[PDB]
Symmetry: none
Subunit: 145 residues, 2 copies
């Protein structure tokens, strides 16, 4: 259970980058390629994990705002989280591989998978309609190391 | 470099923009001026980039599982690169059959550029070009 660095891009080749402290998927080229966000990962045996950016300084979570289930980026240290604390569960994600791609399902909001839009520069989100082909839910997740 | 062509399908439909969505229909009267010529930057062997407006807008295929989508992105066709991972979505493979031509998505293999049998529908992509529902055969005339 320690911090690993991963590079991620969806099946349409979009990368993650921040815009107004929001995570968005898009195509970075040239000087802007330096905006690419690597994903910091702390494994939770056997198939879950905590996901973050900026050296695990900000972590991804699933939050329910009234009637909405939205992805959120919180200012918490990936290292303070615990697979055994009820409150940190909103940060857990289940990793599932199939072929050369990877999917991430929310542990606190099951049935919700991390996703990106087909159009560029849209924020990264969570959809509960994976196979219904509107949002992308498959990613190439590789250990940047 | 950029080569220009005129395109029209086997049913005589031409491409034109409608609410900035590439649609295919029959232009009449002063509307014939709405025809969109296709700009091409070939990629040896038989691959190529396709655009309109002097290469200022290029078509691409983006997928989501078992479904694909045809998009017109505001990118310069000259900035696209064949040795660039992300630009593959703009690549198309050309094939000719007799006097006709077909275009297959490199990013979404098995999906061909196609038109609806009826007029004024958006140009799209189809995974089944054989079972004739959508039209996938085109006349592609090099504007020389």
């Amino acid at each position: 259970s320690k911090m690993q660095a991963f590079r991620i891009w969806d099946v349409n080749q979009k990368t993650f980058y921040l815009r107004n402290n929001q995570l968005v998927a898009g195509y970075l080229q040239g000087p802007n390629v330096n905006l690419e966000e690597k994903i910091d990962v702390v494994p939770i045996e056997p198939h879950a994990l905590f996901l973050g950016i900026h050296g695990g300084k900000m972590c991804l979570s699933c939050v329910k705002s009234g009637d909405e289930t939205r992805l959120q980026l919180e200012a918490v240290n990936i290292t303070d989280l615990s697979e055994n604390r009820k409150q940190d569960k909103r940060f857990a994600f289940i990793r599932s591989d199939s072929g050369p791609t990877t999917s991430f399902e929310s542990a606190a909001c099951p049935g919700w998978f991390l996703c990106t839009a087909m159009e560029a520069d849209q924020p990264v989100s969570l959809t509960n309609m994976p196979d219904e082909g509107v949002m992308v839910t498959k990613f190439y997740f590789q250990e940047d190391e």
